[PDB]
Amino acid sequence: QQRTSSLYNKTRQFGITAALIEILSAMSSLEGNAMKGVRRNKFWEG
Amino acid sequence: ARRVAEELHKGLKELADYTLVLKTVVDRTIVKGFAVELAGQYVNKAEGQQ
Amino acid sequence: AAKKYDLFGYEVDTNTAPWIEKIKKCKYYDEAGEVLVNMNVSNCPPDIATYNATLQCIYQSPSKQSTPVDNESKFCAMMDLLEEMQHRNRLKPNEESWTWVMKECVKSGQFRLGYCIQQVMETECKGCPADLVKANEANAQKAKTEGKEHPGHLSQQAGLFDVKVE
Amino acid sequence: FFKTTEMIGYVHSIDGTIATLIPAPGNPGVAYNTIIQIQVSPTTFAAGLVFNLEKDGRIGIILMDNITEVQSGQKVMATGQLLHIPVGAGVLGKVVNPLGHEVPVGTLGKVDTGAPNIVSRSPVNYNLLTGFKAVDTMIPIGRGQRELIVGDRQTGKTSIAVSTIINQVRINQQILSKNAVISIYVSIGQRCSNVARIHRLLQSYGALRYTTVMAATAAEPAGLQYLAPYAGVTMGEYFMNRGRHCLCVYDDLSKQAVAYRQISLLLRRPPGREAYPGDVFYLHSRLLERAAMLSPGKGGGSVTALPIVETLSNDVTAYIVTNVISITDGQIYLDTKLFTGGQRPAVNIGLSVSRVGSSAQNAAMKGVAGKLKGILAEYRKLAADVQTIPMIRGARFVALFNQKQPSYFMNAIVSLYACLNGYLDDVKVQYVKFYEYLLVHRDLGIMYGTAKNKFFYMYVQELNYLIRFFTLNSPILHGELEEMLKQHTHLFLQHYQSKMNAIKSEKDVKALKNLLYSCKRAV
Amino acid sequence: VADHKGRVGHVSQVIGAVVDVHFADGVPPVLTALDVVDKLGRDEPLTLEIVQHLDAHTGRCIAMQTTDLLKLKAKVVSTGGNISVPVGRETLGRIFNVLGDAIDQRGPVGEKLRMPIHAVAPKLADQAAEDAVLTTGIKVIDLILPYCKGGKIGLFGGAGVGKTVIIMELINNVAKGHGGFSVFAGVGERTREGTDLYLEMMQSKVIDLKGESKCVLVYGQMNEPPGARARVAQSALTMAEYFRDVEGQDVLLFIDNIFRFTQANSEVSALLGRIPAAVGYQPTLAEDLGQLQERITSTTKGSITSVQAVYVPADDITDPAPATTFSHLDATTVLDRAVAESGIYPAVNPLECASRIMDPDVISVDHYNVAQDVVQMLTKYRELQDIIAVLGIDELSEEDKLIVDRARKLVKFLSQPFQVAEVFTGMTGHYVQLDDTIDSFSGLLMGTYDQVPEMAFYMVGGINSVLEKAKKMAEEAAELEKMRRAR
Numbered sequence A: 001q002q003r004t005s006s007l008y009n010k011t012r013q014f015g016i017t018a019a020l021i022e023i024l025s026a027m028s029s030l031e032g033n034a035m036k037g038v039r040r041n042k043f044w045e046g
Numbered sequence B: 001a002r003r004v005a006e007e008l009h010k011g012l013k014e015l016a017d018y019t020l021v022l023k024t025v026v027d028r029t030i031v032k033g034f035a036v037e038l039a040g041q042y043v044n045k046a047e048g049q050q
Numbered sequence C: 001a002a003k004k005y006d007l008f009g010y011e012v013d014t015n016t017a018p019w020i021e022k023i024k025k026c027k028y029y030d031e032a033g034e035v036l037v038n039m040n041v042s043n044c045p046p047d048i049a050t051y052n053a054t055l056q057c058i059y060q061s062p063s064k065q066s067t068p069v070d071n072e073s074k075f076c077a078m079m080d081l082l083e084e085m086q087h088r089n090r091l092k093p094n095e096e097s098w099t100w101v102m103k104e105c106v107k108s109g110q111f112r113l114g115y116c117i118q119q120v121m122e123t124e125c126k127g128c129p130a131d132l133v134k135a136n137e138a139n140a141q142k143a144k145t146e147g148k149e150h151p152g153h154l155s156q157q158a159g160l161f162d163v164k165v166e
Numbered sequence D: 001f002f003k004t005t006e007m008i009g010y011v012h013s014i015d016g017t018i019a020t021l022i023p024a025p026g027n028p029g030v031a032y033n034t035i036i037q038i039q040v041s042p043t044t045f046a047a048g049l050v051f052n053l054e055k056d057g058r059i060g061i062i063l064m065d066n067i068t069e070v071q072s073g074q075k076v077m078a079t080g081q082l083l084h085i086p087v088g089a090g091v092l093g094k095v096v097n098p099l100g101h102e103v104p105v106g107t108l109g110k111v112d113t114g115a116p117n118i119v120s121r122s123p124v125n126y127n128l129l130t131g132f133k134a135v136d137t138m139i140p141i142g143r144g145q146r147e148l149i150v151g152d153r154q155t156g157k158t159s160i161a162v163s164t165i166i167n168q169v170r171i172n173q174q175i176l177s178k179n180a181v182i183s184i185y186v187s188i189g190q191r192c193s194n195v196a197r198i199h200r201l202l203q204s205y206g207a208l209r210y211t212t213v214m215a216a217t218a219a220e221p222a223g224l225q226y227l228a229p230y231a232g233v234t235m236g237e238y239f240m241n242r243g244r245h246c247l248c249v250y251d252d253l254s255k256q257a258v259a260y261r262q263i264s265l266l267l268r269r270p271p272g273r274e275a276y277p278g279d280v281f282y283l284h285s286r287l288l289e290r291a292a293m294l295s296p297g298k299g300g301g302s303v304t305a306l307p308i309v310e311t312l313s314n315d316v317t318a319y320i321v322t323n324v325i326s327i328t329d330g331q332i333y334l335d336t337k338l339f340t341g342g343q344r345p346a347v348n349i350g351l352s353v354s355r356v357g358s359s360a361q362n363a364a365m366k367g368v369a370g371k372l373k374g375i376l377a378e379y380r381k382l383a384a385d386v387q388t389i390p391m392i393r394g395a396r397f398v399a400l401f402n403q404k405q406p407s408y409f410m411n412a413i414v415s416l417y418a419c420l421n422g423y424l425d426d427v428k429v430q431y432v433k434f435y436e437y438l439l440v441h442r443d444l445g446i447m448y449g450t451a452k453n454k455f456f457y458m459y460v461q462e463l464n465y466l467i468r469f470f471t472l473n474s475p476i477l478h479g480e481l482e483e484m485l486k487q488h489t490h491l492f493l494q495h496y497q498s499k500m501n502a503i504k505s506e507k508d509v510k511a512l513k514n515l516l517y518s519c520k521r522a523v
Numbered sequence E: 001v002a003d004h005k006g007r008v009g010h011v012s013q014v015i016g017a018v019v020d021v022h023f024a025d026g027v028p029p030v031l032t033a034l035d036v037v038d039k040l041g042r043d044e045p046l047t048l049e050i051v052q053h054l055d056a057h058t059g060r061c062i063a064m065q066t067t068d069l070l071k072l073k074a075k076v077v078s079t080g081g082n083i084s085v086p087v088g089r090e091t092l093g094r095i096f097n098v099l100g101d102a103i104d105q106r107g108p109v110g111e112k113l114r115m116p117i118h119a120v121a122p123k124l125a126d127q128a129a130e131d132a133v134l135t136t137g138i139k140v141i142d143l144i145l146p147y148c149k150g151g152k153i154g155l156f157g158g159a160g161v162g163k164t165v166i167i168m169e170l171i172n173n174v175a176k177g178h179g180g181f182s183v184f185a186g187v188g189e190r191t192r193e194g195t196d197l198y199l200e201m202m203q204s205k206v207i208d209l210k211g212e213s214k215c216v217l218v219y220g221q222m223n224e225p226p227g228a229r230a231r232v233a234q235s236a237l238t239m240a241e242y243f244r245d246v247e248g249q250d251v252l253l254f255i256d257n258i259f260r261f262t263q264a265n266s267e268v269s270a271l272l273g274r275i276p277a278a279v280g281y282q283p284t285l286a287e288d289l290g291q292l293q294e295r296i297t298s299t300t301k302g303s304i305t306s307v308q309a310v311y312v313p314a315d316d317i318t319d320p321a322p323a324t325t326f327s328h329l330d331a332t333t334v335l336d337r338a339v340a341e342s343g344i345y346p347a348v349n350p351l352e353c354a355s356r357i358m359d360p361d362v363i364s365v366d367h368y369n370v371a372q373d374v375v376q377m378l379t380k381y382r383e384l385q386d387i388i389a390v391l392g393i394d395e396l397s398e399e400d401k402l403i404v405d406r407a408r409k410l411v412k413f414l415s416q417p418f419q420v421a422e423v424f425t426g427m428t429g430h431y432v433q434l435d436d437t438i439d440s441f442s443g444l445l446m447g448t449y450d451q452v453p454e455m456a457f458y459m460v461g462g463i464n465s466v467l468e469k470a471k472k473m474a475e476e477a478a479e480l481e482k483m484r485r486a487r
């Protein structure tokens, strides 16, 4: 029981971490593809 | 090169009224010969290192 | 005469006369299979006559192909064709097909397959032709007298530790 | 009268096995999913596949060959056509790439075709004999079926598929070429040495005459590994659309997924589960949907798929493994514990299933398999919880399922019938393989001069088709089959099992043990 | 910008199955269908559906066919509205696709009306209360989780547990004699299964080509791109809604598999610039499924008896997609792989199933009492199995041995051979009447059949079949005893 409980705790922590890392990796990939276009502002007026 | 460019120009119907202009670009990938590119039509008559 | 329909109800071409003529002009019986393939592709399923023509071509052809093919057997090809016809096409072989098989068995000297086909014809068909049965019996007697009834190695005495298990 | 190509831009960036192009202003432009040629030299080109068409005009390319020659700033020509590869009977017996280039050994088919329509198929009713008693009986496979081969590393996934390919050599040589089964062995991300060994093994048995190998080794770019299954099935679809039957083997889809994930990630595709691309299911889904059984109106040809998939520690809960399992019409699960326990092939009958069922079985095999399934189910139920008939015969059936090479249909069906009708009740479980070897490769009745059968003998290999036509439980063959089995059982018991049970000497015991082990690997 | 019919646009981006179109006069409304009029040397027409508006001029769309041979700046013309699908009795006996085009090669279809595949779900005031038991002829379903007419049913299960076979049995038992019409929607499944279903329906005269048919087939399968698998269900549901409203008929709706709709949406979500949710489904998993589910309902005009097959990835019933579908159903049938491996078919886990009409007010008092007693006995047997595993059957009390025996007989008596799985089983199927099931289980609970052998309840129908099998078992056992006696 002690060994299985330790494995259960370890597995849940790893699963949470892996899921969060996967989501953040997807978010970073989405952010990277985004490109900043030309700014249409009165640059001289400054 | 001029003859090839003119022949390609004749084939293209869209460029019938367009004037022909020749622009020279140096390519280090070819050692002998020449190539012509006009409106996407590319003719290769060159050779490289053996 | 009557239009035939496929599994989904689509009509299938029934004029299979030209294909039979093509089958009856082949040199090697493997080319007969090509004609059947062309028939199937052209939505012209073979009928009983086409299978009998193919069996005749198998019996009357010199070999399977222009170049020899190892372990080629006319009997196996015809039996496979009959299995296809009866099972995957729902067509009962007639007397002609079994007579062709029996003729092949007699011609090739296989007098045991001859007995099996003789029993088959006696059971399903209205008996086996007397000539074929007599020829098969003659082949069996010739094999028996010459001592080639069974392979020689099978008659060799063996033992628990005298058998070579490859 | 010039061979004018269609230049569409230049090579901008190179990141490993993928590249990005920049279109020259005022050019025709390239079409999606088409092939392009990168002019690495005035006379040499490197193939590539269009994958992305961005808003900026840049083009994502998947390099296919001559990657080392690709440099930034080189011209790119657009062919304007999808990928087509050579197809025909002239490719059999050769090793080729996904692009169709032949690999030296020591008609054009489109690679992006669609699967047959709903009304273009017919029910699976033609069996594809793998040669293994366990699979042929408990896991029927029919032509036009997708059967997954899932398991762990070093469990026989490749061996069973290669045996299935080899098992067709003997059949193809006898029956007409109309019903012959052609094989397309696709190696994906495997070692080059393994490909050579498999080629030599196929050549030894003469399977190259009916088989072609498509290889994308580990040293090749991911693009070729990603396209290998599609090119292989395309080569196999040539025979399907012409009234012929083919067998396609994918070894293995696990590595194709890795290659596709690499390509997608490098080309800035959003990662999904386990970093795989979102549309990773659709890849295999459209790959395996192209294997079907065409209706009689379209010729009646078929393609049979045997995709192979690897698991980790017998974990079938993985991502791609689940996707492939949810696509195929069945699965042969090879268990590691059974493999190490001496059961080979390690087919886990409990976890294996064929959704086609008995429809993909010959009339001769139908009754034997139907009774065998019930006997094995009862044996497993009782074993998990008294030598009853089900328990006496279940153990011998399990003993008969151990094989090293594919078995001829006549031998396998005869042995299964003998074990089914209690002819092996008096035979010890350890001696079942020796009994089967004597039955197949020997004739005790002829040896002892007690054989009165007229035609039914195990050395008459032509009886295989007669058995397949009429079945064993028919008046034509049943009487002689029973007589032969009775004579063989009596002679075997008397002249062999009495002596085998009387061995005590260490030399004789070792000799008998070696004999039994050899028999296990001989039949 | 009211009528956008014929509005011209140009393709601006192509990444996988997602395509961006630029309109100079303004992007048409979302869910609008677009046709790629440009001649690209394609063998099939290309149609796009607007799913998002990037700005006042650009719009992100999803293609219904493969985007091969698609170039940038390709001309696109709006169709003036959403995707339309033919409706009416002229669609009976035909096979359609996501776009509503006949694919059975059986000639043109005479369509008098077409309806968009996207519609607003019925409101609260349009809800009808129909509590009537639906007899499926299956002992387990009729007893533990009875189905209700005009309600929603779900067949949750993994891969290979028997979801498709149960659907085929339900068709054979309910659709052949159904008064109204039927609509089968194949979503992201095997094409060969569709062919088998079509052949079976033609043989069973449900689809009478020469006569009058009473069912419609709409197929979007695995080979199709994700765009078609996310709208084939909408097309089939639109046909069912028309039959419900305009025809005022009672219609059956079979969906297999409803999970593929979620899977297709998740596949396309990544390319739409949406951050994945937990597990890796799209963030709009709940709302997308809810909108479709709310349309599958019985209103005051007609009734739809919907049967949906739900796929549970890797048998993980806690997965978000299976977990989100439970609340949208009136009767859930949860299949278990462990039950199937034991030879029990259908592999229904009665301790995990539930029914809304499992109330004394809706069903008879005897039915409710028998079902509750069966469930309680099964739960008690599950509890006692652990003690048996540790101690052993011999260690249990007589009060517990009787419960164990009755529970084993109940477990084996729940199995039934289906008329559609004859090839799988090799035996003729049974159709058990509702009253027969109740009487048989009531008798078994109180011990009327304590002396019957346990195996007599395995793969049989009513109680009469049990007695016949027991008699056959006794006869064969007597024959075996006689054989032993002679020896």
Ligand SMILES: Nc1ncnc2c1ncn2[C@@H]1O[C@H](COP(=O)(O)OP(=O)(O)OP(=O)(O)O)[C@@H](O)[C@H]1O
Pocket (backbone or CB within 6 Å): D151, D152, D153, D154, D155, D156, D157, D158, D159, D160, D344, D345, D403, D404, D405
């Ligand atoms: N039926 C069999 N009987 C005996 N040995 C076998 C059998 N099948 C396979 N083997 C042996 O088991 C080993 C593994 O077989 P195989 O190469 O087919 O496995 P695999 O599933 O392809 O594994 P991997 O490709 O990951 O190495 C080899 O040595 C092979 O010869």
Ligand SMILES: Nc1ncnc2c1ncn2[C@@H]1O[C@H](COP(=O)(O)OP(=O)(O)O)[C@@H](O)[C@H]1O
Pocket (backbone or CB within 6 Å): D353, D354, D355, D356, D357, E157, E158, E159, E160, E161, E162, E163, E164, E165, E166, E345, E346, E418, E421, E424, E425
């Ligand atoms: N009623 C049944 N009787 C026997 N076997 C069944 C039954 N239902 C399912 N099976 C088994 O499952 C297979 C069919 O699986 P299927 O219904 O397609 O499941 P799913 O769609 O959930 O994967 C059959 O070939 C058989 O092995």
Ligand SMILES: [Mg+2]
Pocket (backbone or CB within 6 Å): D157, D158, D159, D251
């Ligand atoms: Mg391997």
Ligand SMILES: [Mg+2]
Pocket (backbone or CB within 6 Å): E163, E164, E189
């Ligand atoms: Mg299914």
